[PDB]
Design a protein around this ligand. Sequence first.
Ligand code: MG
Length: 86
Amino acid sequence: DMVKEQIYTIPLREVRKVPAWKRANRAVIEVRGFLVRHMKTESVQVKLDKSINEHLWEKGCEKPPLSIRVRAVKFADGEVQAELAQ
RNA sequence: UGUUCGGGUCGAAGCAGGGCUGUGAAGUCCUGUGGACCGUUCACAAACGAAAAUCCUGGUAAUAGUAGCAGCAAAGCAGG
Ligand SMILES: [Mg+2]
C-alpha cells in the first residue's frame, strides 16, 4: 500500500530545446524520467494517469506547458501511480 | 588407335604438401585424403599445351557496416 506519498512540481523547460512538433513526446519522456530518478524505480514501473496525458496534449503537440504539478504514490510491489495534482 | 610387357580393394585416377633426378619442357618416389580404374616398347593420328584479346561463362573481394531508408501530405501519446 502507501509507502511514499508526495507531491512534485516537475519542470519542463529543457523540453523546449527540441523541434517544435516533437515537444509533447519529449514532455512525456521527461515526466517519466523525473519520476524514475526521484522515486528510485525501473522505468517500466511508472504509470501515468490519463489526466497527465490530457494536460500535456491540451494545446497541441507544439505548446506543452512549462511546468506541471503531479501527485505520485509508491507501493511495495513497485508500481507508482502518478495522477495530476491540482 | 595398332602392337609388346604389366599394375590395382594388401587400395587406381584425382587433390594438398614435400625428397631426388634433368640445362629445361618434365619425370619419379614419400606422407594425408580418396574408393575404381591406370600404364608401358615400337609406330601412327589430332576437336593437342594460355598470363594478356575495354576476351566469354561462373564464383568472389575491396569500396563498407559506407550511401540510401529526409525535400512534394514534419504524427503521434496514455491506459488495457
Ligand atoms: Mg585463364
